[PDB]
Amino acid sequence: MIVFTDLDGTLLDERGELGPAREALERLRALGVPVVPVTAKTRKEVEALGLEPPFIVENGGGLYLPRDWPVRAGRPKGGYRVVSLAWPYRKVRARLREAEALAGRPILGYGDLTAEAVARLTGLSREAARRAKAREYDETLVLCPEEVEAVLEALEAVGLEWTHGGRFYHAAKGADKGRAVARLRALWPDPEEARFAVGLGDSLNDLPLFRAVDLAVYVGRGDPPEGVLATPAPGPEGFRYAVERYLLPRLS
Amino acid sequence: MIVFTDLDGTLLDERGELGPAREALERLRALGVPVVPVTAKTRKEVEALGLEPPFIVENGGGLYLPRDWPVRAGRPKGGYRVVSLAWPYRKVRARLREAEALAGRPILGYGDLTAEAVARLTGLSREAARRAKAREYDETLVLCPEEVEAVLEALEAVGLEWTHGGRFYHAAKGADKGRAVARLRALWPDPEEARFAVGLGDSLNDLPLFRAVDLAVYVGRGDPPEGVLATPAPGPEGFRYAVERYLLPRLS
Ligand code: VN3
Ligand SMILES: [Mg+2]
Ligand SMILES: [Mg+2]
């Protein structure tokens, strides 16, 4: 059993902390159950959280493995081995300029904004904003609500893909949480262990995650998507519930 | 006679060049007629055009005098004395953050954007974008079209003023071309020379300039505001016609 889980609004609280998750998290670890972050966040953001590989960054664009991963894959990053699944950021940004020319109105993302602007926009510290701006694959977009429809069409027209992270739209090519989860499972040292996967998430960018797992759980704020399971309370308390009620019993 | 002139679309062509206005400027210079740029550009942009003081920047936000101006006014800054008529950029920016809170909606301006983004949005080179970003008084805003109304109301609620410059909205407090012109005329060394003022502009937002001068000339496209003289052709060619027909004969 491997647990794949979103961070913001799933495992992390309203200020990116943990909440009751410590309880549940420490429990899974004690039982030897691998927990794998699958997030829209960047590697720098994941590192600042103290999280260790394997983890999946930027909506599936990068899959990070420990340096000594028993299954040889990806390229060395000094401490890691990286499996790049998506186009690099610079290519997404270039292609975004063409979407913008097509749309005939500004299309702004994180790459266009100062760390100060991103911090003000998100409520983050200046430092956290710099880490969110250090993107390798995926662009976070800051779109006008009424321009969204025209913008998404322009993205499609120029060969980009889009998703929604909970507050912001994202643009990328080849980044998909489920594709990254499938790749990691296929690279797992213990095939029997990987044969059963759990997925927890809260946003549109997590539908690909739910479809790639065997047991899917929605701890988001609204109604569960097609056929996925639910919890009494959202976020980290929904996470704790899922572990106690859905997971532990399946460990027999 | 003092000639006050708008730059872009008036004294400069669509390439930022002088064209037929070059000979006209030389002619005025030869007759000792002072010419005073009145522009929405920053001091850094004006310097890159190689223009010497006196000149008026950022839509009347600031009046730049030569350091040795015979009338003592403004604050010494290198080879200038600066008469600040508007609130400083830093204060406008602070007020913008207050407005953003009130509007419950992001309000993005040049200060939030990289030079690269400003360049992309304006068609400028990165270097010219950097000079466009070195603002001392007014902020250029990049507003969502369906959000303008609410944003503008919030700007006013926090004591800011706004205008629409043709492409973007602008925010400032106390920046008014007409007031800057009246001030410079009041600070003119020779009161007799300052009693007759010419204003040339190419846009409807030059109206404050047109009101503060005695002879107002519009070289833009379509019809001039009521009370304002027009020329057969637009831009620098109109500037040329204006000097020849209205100014030159008057100097004899
Ligand atoms: O950690 V997430 O909001 O994809
Ligand atoms: Mg999330
Ligand atoms: Mg103009």
XYZ file of C-alpha atoms and ligand atoms in Angstrom:
510
model
C 0.000 0.000 0.000
C 1.326 3.368 -1.117
C -0.476 6.556 -0.189
C -0.295 9.346 -2.756
C -1.517 12.654 -1.411
C -1.948 16.272 -2.370
C -0.485 18.870 0.013
C -2.438 22.147 0.151
C -5.991 21.657 1.377
C -5.404 17.923 1.730
C -2.491 17.181 4.033
C -1.607 20.763 4.965
C -3.781 23.226 6.874
C -4.940 26.738 5.982
C -1.413 28.015 6.664
C 0.574 25.060 5.291
C 1.258 23.299 8.591
C -0.331 19.861 9.157
C -3.187 20.036 11.660
C -4.380 16.604 12.851
C -2.290 15.152 10.016
C 0.710 14.612 12.300
C -1.371 12.009 14.105
C -2.359 10.136 10.953
C 0.941 10.705 9.163
C 3.131 9.428 11.997
C 0.786 6.432 12.151
C 1.215 5.457 8.496
C 4.982 5.840 8.838
C 5.088 3.678 11.957
C 3.282 0.978 9.986
C 5.790 1.241 7.155
C 3.294 2.674 4.669
C 5.002 4.901 2.067
C 3.476 8.357 1.761
C 4.173 10.208 -1.492
C 3.471 13.928 -1.943
C 1.882 14.748 -5.321
C 1.574 18.499 -5.548
C 1.349 21.606 -7.733
C 4.212 22.977 -5.603
C 7.808 23.200 -6.777
C 10.725 21.129 -5.511
C 12.052 24.099 -3.523
C 8.657 24.401 -1.837
C 8.597 20.702 -1.054
C 12.113 20.851 0.327
C 11.276 23.814 2.565
C 8.544 21.616 4.050
C 11.172 19.065 5.053
C 9.695 16.390 2.782
C 11.901 13.618 1.396
C 11.795 11.907 -2.006
C 10.151 10.149 -3.630
C 7.769 12.995 -4.399
C 5.982 14.427 -7.421
C 6.149 18.152 -8.171
C 4.387 20.724 -10.343
C 1.221 18.753 -11.171
C 3.131 15.724 -12.436
C 5.863 17.515 -14.388
C 8.722 16.217 -12.286
C 9.094 12.924 -10.420
C 11.874 13.073 -7.845
C 13.555 9.894 -6.533
C 16.196 9.338 -3.854
C 19.744 9.249 -5.215
C 20.133 5.554 -4.304
C 16.749 4.418 -5.604
C 17.166 0.661 -6.225
C 15.530 1.043 -9.655
C 17.743 2.985 -12.064
C 15.777 5.774 -13.740
C 15.979 9.479 -14.548
C 19.001 11.782 -14.254
C 21.173 12.714 -11.233
C 20.454 15.961 -9.355
C 23.240 15.544 -6.816
C 20.863 14.441 -4.097
C 18.134 13.146 -6.351
C 17.400 11.351 -9.531
C 14.837 13.262 -11.575
C 12.366 11.829 -14.052
C 11.197 14.737 -16.205
C 7.724 14.024 -17.549
C 6.745 17.443 -18.880
C 8.133 20.253 -21.067
C 10.530 22.568 -19.245
C 9.133 25.876 -17.884
C 11.008 28.000 -20.407
C 9.255 26.245 -23.263
C 5.842 26.651 -21.610
C 6.557 30.364 -21.094
C 7.580 30.835 -24.742
C 4.463 29.036 -25.950
C 2.392 31.207 -23.561
C 3.554 34.308 -25.465
C 1.934 32.830 -28.545
C -1.279 32.046 -26.639
C -1.231 35.665 -25.494
C -0.737 37.040 -28.998
C -3.658 34.867 -30.062
C -5.943 35.904 -27.182
C -5.222 39.582 -27.830
C -5.070 40.362 -24.120
C -2.422 39.962 -21.425
C -1.895 36.505 -20.008
C 0.063 36.827 -16.781
C 1.704 34.092 -14.764
C 4.171 33.786 -11.900
C 7.020 34.221 -14.355
C 5.756 37.748 -15.076
C 5.467 38.792 -11.418
C 7.966 39.793 -8.756
C 8.261 37.649 -5.635
C 6.723 40.615 -3.821
C 3.655 40.536 -6.061
C 3.274 36.766 -5.713
C 3.608 37.025 -1.913
C 0.980 39.732 -1.780
C -1.272 37.723 -4.055
C -1.030 34.448 -2.137
C -0.500 35.628 1.442
C 2.955 34.054 1.538
C 6.210 35.443 2.864
C 8.639 36.927 0.344
C 10.792 33.835 0.777
C 7.975 31.361 0.196
C 6.996 33.365 -2.901
C 10.508 32.938 -4.322
C 10.215 29.179 -3.843
C 6.794 29.086 -5.571
C 8.365 31.076 -8.468
C 11.206 28.586 -8.900
C 9.267 26.521 -11.446
C 10.817 23.867 -13.696
C 7.796 22.650 -15.655
C 4.431 24.192 -14.914
C 3.291 27.849 -14.959
C 0.861 29.262 -12.444
C -1.488 31.652 -14.209
C -3.235 34.708 -12.795
C -6.303 35.066 -14.974
C -9.209 37.464 -15.111
C -12.380 35.465 -14.247
C -14.251 36.662 -17.352
C -11.276 36.012 -19.646
C -10.750 32.429 -18.511
C -12.780 30.848 -21.297
C -10.993 32.757 -24.084
C -7.617 32.127 -22.382
C -8.077 28.353 -22.056
C -9.025 28.148 -25.753
C -5.861 30.046 -26.736
C -3.782 27.620 -24.612
C -5.372 24.678 -26.398
C -4.936 26.365 -29.763
C -1.171 26.626 -29.246
C -0.654 23.106 -27.906
C -0.577 23.747 -24.165
C -2.640 21.908 -21.570
C -4.328 23.500 -18.588
C -5.677 22.542 -15.182
C -6.983 24.227 -12.037
C -5.149 23.988 -8.730
C -7.862 25.244 -6.385
C -7.449 28.994 -6.854
C -5.160 29.416 -9.894
C -5.177 27.970 -13.370
C -1.978 26.265 -14.525
C -0.377 25.799 -17.919
C 1.986 23.024 -18.961
C 2.570 20.197 -21.450
C 2.824 16.577 -20.349
C 2.257 17.352 -16.645
C -0.436 15.105 -15.220
C -0.626 13.804 -11.656
C -1.869 10.385 -12.773
C 0.858 9.908 -15.364
C 3.437 10.708 -12.707
C 1.798 8.348 -10.189
C 1.721 5.532 -12.776
C 5.399 6.104 -13.560
C 6.390 6.001 -9.893
C 4.403 2.829 -9.234
C 6.131 1.250 -12.232
C 9.473 2.298 -10.718
C 8.676 0.953 -7.243
C 11.258 -1.453 -5.689
C 8.469 -3.623 -4.208
C 5.913 -4.473 -6.938
C 3.511 -6.114 -4.493
C 3.555 -2.983 -2.362
C 2.833 -0.778 -5.364
C 0.000 -3.024 -6.500
C -2.336 -1.175 -4.165
C -2.378 2.636 -4.322
C -4.382 5.219 -2.406
C -4.977 8.774 -3.621
C -6.087 11.778 -1.569
C -6.745 15.233 -3.000
C -9.039 18.259 -3.114
C -8.946 19.995 -6.529
C -9.398 19.691 -10.310
C -5.701 18.895 -10.745
C -6.343 15.816 -8.566
C -8.865 14.074 -10.844
C -5.963 12.561 -12.783
C -4.703 11.345 -9.378
C -7.989 9.711 -8.400
C -8.116 7.855 -11.726
C -4.574 6.547 -11.313
C -5.174 4.988 -7.887
C -7.126 1.976 -6.624
C -8.729 3.752 -3.686
C -9.486 7.450 -4.148
C -10.523 9.902 -1.400
C -11.767 13.492 -1.744
C -11.196 15.783 1.228
C -12.048 18.965 -0.668
C -14.701 21.515 0.226
C -17.499 20.576 -2.186
C -19.196 17.449 -3.526
C -17.097 14.380 -4.435
C -16.299 13.910 -8.146
C -17.479 10.884 -10.162
C -17.520 7.890 -7.826
C -14.771 9.019 -5.441
C -15.117 8.619 -1.653
C -15.633 11.383 0.901
C -14.871 12.408 4.481
C -16.919 14.245 7.167
C -14.568 17.243 7.406
C -12.286 18.735 4.722
C -8.504 19.041 4.672
C -6.201 17.419 7.278
C -9.147 16.248 9.428
C -10.574 14.532 6.360
C -7.120 13.045 5.899
C -6.956 11.740 9.472
C -10.430 10.266 9.067
C -9.440 8.526 5.846
C -6.394 6.920 7.467
C -8.220 5.721 10.564
C -11.392 4.560 8.806
C -10.331 3.558 5.274
C -6.629 2.651 5.383
C -5.605 0.982 8.637
C -8.351 -1.660 8.306
C -7.073 -2.509 4.803
C -3.698 -3.276 6.367
C -4.180 -6.964 7.177
C 6.385 82.228 -26.371
C 6.934 78.849 -24.748
C 6.053 75.717 -26.703
C 4.794 72.872 -24.543
C 4.704 69.575 -26.389
C 3.539 66.035 -25.885
C 6.118 63.482 -27.118
C 4.692 60.166 -28.393
C 2.381 60.648 -31.369
C 3.183 64.378 -31.496
C 6.901 65.204 -31.540
C 7.845 61.589 -32.208
C 6.549 59.231 -34.890
C 5.346 55.651 -34.468
C 8.988 54.530 -34.356
C 9.984 57.063 -31.696
C 11.750 59.182 -34.305
C 11.466 62.880 -35.166
C 10.789 62.714 -38.903
C 9.671 66.115 -40.224
C 9.607 67.505 -36.668
C 13.411 67.623 -36.644
C 13.721 70.662 -38.913
C 10.860 72.317 -36.990
C 12.591 71.909 -33.641
C 15.841 73.295 -35.067
C 13.950 76.293 -36.407
C 12.369 77.068 -33.009
C 15.744 76.544 -31.328
C 17.367 78.977 -33.768
C 14.767 81.641 -32.955
C 15.411 81.041 -29.256
C 11.932 79.610 -28.649
C 11.976 77.277 -25.654
C 10.373 73.859 -26.118
C 9.197 71.935 -23.067
C 8.405 68.221 -23.234
C 5.271 67.282 -21.343
C 5.032 63.539 -21.282
C 3.629 60.458 -19.566
C 7.189 59.024 -19.672
C 9.528 58.706 -16.716
C 12.604 60.884 -16.213
C 14.749 57.852 -17.173
C 12.899 57.490 -20.485
C 13.220 61.210 -21.198
C 16.955 61.050 -20.522
C 17.304 58.125 -22.947
C 15.800 60.360 -25.662
C 18.587 62.771 -24.785
C 16.202 65.594 -23.820
C 17.432 68.344 -21.507
C 15.463 70.043 -18.729
C 13.113 71.757 -18.244
C 10.657 68.929 -18.879
C 7.544 67.532 -17.245
C 7.287 63.785 -16.556
C 4.664 61.206 -15.635
C 1.614 63.202 -16.711
C 2.514 66.233 -14.609
C 3.714 64.272 -11.608
C 7.112 65.944 -11.664
C 8.712 69.073 -13.072
C 12.428 68.780 -13.777
C 14.511 71.976 -13.915
C 18.191 72.459 -14.768
C 20.216 72.670 -11.542
C 21.153 76.295 -12.408
C 17.598 77.533 -13.214
C 17.512 81.273 -12.458
C 14.385 80.875 -10.310
C 15.049 78.894 -7.143
C 12.513 76.086 -6.762
C 12.328 72.363 -6.172
C 14.810 70.020 -4.562
C 18.391 69.659 -5.835
C 19.173 66.297 -7.425
C 22.412 66.089 -9.391
C 22.093 68.272 -12.452
C 18.411 68.980 -11.754
C 16.114 70.661 -9.348
C 12.945 68.594 -8.970
C 9.563 70.089 -8.251
C 7.402 67.198 -7.049
C 3.736 67.926 -7.715
C 2.302 64.449 -7.091
C 2.530 61.845 -4.326
C 5.561 59.608 -4.686
C 5.263 56.226 -6.413
C 5.887 54.423 -3.129
C 2.762 56.031 -1.645
C 0.650 55.317 -4.714
C 1.764 51.686 -4.425
C 0.788 51.566 -0.738
C -2.619 53.018 -1.554
C -2.994 50.456 -4.353
C -2.568 47.643 -1.791
C -5.349 49.234 0.292
C -7.529 49.461 -2.816
C -6.887 45.803 -3.629
C -8.125 44.811 -0.184
C -11.252 46.912 -0.657
C -11.950 45.478 -4.096
C -11.331 41.911 -2.907
C -9.483 41.473 -6.163
C -5.862 41.779 -7.367
C -4.783 45.139 -8.776
C -1.635 44.634 -10.780
C 0.599 47.388 -12.112
C 4.118 47.859 -13.489
C 5.606 47.638 -9.989
C 4.285 44.063 -9.737
C 5.771 42.984 -13.104
C 9.265 42.093 -14.315
C 10.918 44.305 -16.938
C 10.532 41.322 -19.301
C 6.743 41.257 -18.824
C 6.429 45.033 -19.199
C 8.511 44.750 -22.388
C 6.311 41.985 -23.768
C 3.096 43.888 -22.964
C 4.222 47.188 -24.489
C 6.326 45.983 -27.436
C 9.398 47.626 -25.859
C 12.924 46.261 -25.483
C 13.820 44.999 -22.019
C 16.072 48.022 -21.493
C 13.350 50.507 -22.373
C 10.942 48.526 -20.154
C 13.363 49.022 -17.263
C 13.248 52.771 -17.841
C 9.433 52.641 -18.096
C 9.477 50.833 -14.715
C 11.566 53.533 -12.966
C 8.468 55.465 -11.973
C 8.526 58.315 -9.441
C 4.883 59.398 -9.326
C 2.315 57.415 -11.281
C 1.640 53.714 -11.708
C 0.528 52.026 -14.895
C -2.141 49.389 -14.198
C -3.024 46.173 -16.037
C -6.700 45.776 -15.222
C -9.246 43.046 -16.027
C -11.860 44.663 -18.355
C -14.940 43.431 -16.480
C -13.336 44.478 -13.208
C -12.520 48.072 -14.142
C -15.612 49.675 -12.560
C -15.060 48.120 -9.133
C -11.310 48.728 -9.262
C -11.650 52.389 -10.201
C -14.194 52.898 -7.408
C -11.725 51.383 -4.938
C -8.880 53.604 -6.230
C -10.997 56.680 -5.559
C -12.058 55.360 -2.142
C -8.419 55.319 -1.050
C -7.819 58.826 -2.341
C -6.132 57.979 -5.645
C -6.913 59.534 -9.032
C -6.985 57.665 -12.327
C -6.918 58.199 -16.072
C -6.941 55.933 -19.139
C -3.953 56.520 -21.362
C -5.205 54.755 -24.467
C -4.023 51.249 -23.568
C -3.808 50.969 -19.776
C -5.274 52.735 -16.760
C -3.000 54.913 -14.649
C -3.126 55.794 -10.981
C -1.563 58.778 -9.206
C -2.434 61.629 -6.849
C -1.733 65.205 -7.946
C -0.360 64.404 -11.404
C -1.927 66.814 -13.847
C -0.316 68.123 -17.009
C -2.190 71.452 -16.818
C -1.091 72.132 -13.258
C 2.564 71.321 -14.074
C 2.411 73.681 -17.031
C 0.928 76.500 -14.915
C 3.641 75.876 -12.327
C 6.521 75.990 -14.853
C 5.083 79.177 -16.336
C 4.977 80.637 -12.817
C 8.633 79.618 -12.364
C 9.771 81.059 -15.697
C 12.773 83.405 -15.472
C 11.317 85.896 -17.960
C 7.637 86.593 -17.110
C 7.115 88.226 -20.522
C 8.177 85.086 -22.420
C 5.872 82.986 -20.232
C 2.755 85.068 -20.977
C 2.151 83.260 -24.249
C 2.144 79.477 -24.161
C 1.565 76.939 -26.917
C 0.468 73.358 -26.223
C 0.612 70.564 -28.790
C -0.738 67.063 -28.189
C -2.122 64.126 -30.156
C -4.737 62.760 -27.767
C -7.925 63.606 -25.918
C -6.075 63.129 -22.638
C -3.983 66.174 -23.539
C -7.015 68.300 -22.687
C -5.516 69.374 -19.350
C -2.479 70.548 -21.318
C -4.742 72.341 -23.862
C -6.589 74.205 -21.085
C -3.433 75.529 -19.407
C -1.970 77.139 -22.557
C -3.084 80.063 -24.713
C -2.749 78.443 -28.127
C -3.820 74.802 -28.208
C -3.012 72.546 -31.196
C -4.173 68.958 -31.697
C -2.198 66.753 -34.093
C -3.980 63.485 -33.312
C -6.329 61.509 -35.521
C -9.944 62.523 -35.967
C -11.426 65.699 -34.524
C -9.842 67.963 -31.892
C -11.573 68.848 -28.611
C -13.750 71.942 -28.835
C -11.649 75.091 -28.700
C -8.565 73.348 -30.065
C -6.875 73.987 -33.430
C -6.295 71.085 -35.804
C -3.739 70.347 -38.519
C -4.246 68.677 -41.942
C -2.037 65.683 -41.066
C -1.195 63.896 -37.765
C 1.948 63.411 -35.691
C 5.297 65.137 -36.445
C 3.988 66.373 -39.794
C 1.226 68.182 -37.910
C 3.844 69.513 -35.513
C 5.741 70.823 -38.550
C 2.663 72.466 -40.045
C 1.850 73.997 -36.642
C 5.234 75.660 -36.243
C 5.232 77.011 -39.792
C 1.694 78.364 -39.846
C 1.003 79.363 -36.227
C 4.367 80.060 -34.567
C 6.852 81.249 -37.195
C 4.683 84.085 -38.511
C 3.993 85.205 -34.949
C 7.707 85.703 -34.312
C 7.862 88.668 -36.691
O -0.162 20.683 -2.908
V -1.589 21.089 -4.105
O -2.633 22.664 -3.815
O -1.552 20.344 -5.859
Mg -4.554 21.040 -3.206
Mg 0.775 61.224 -26.692
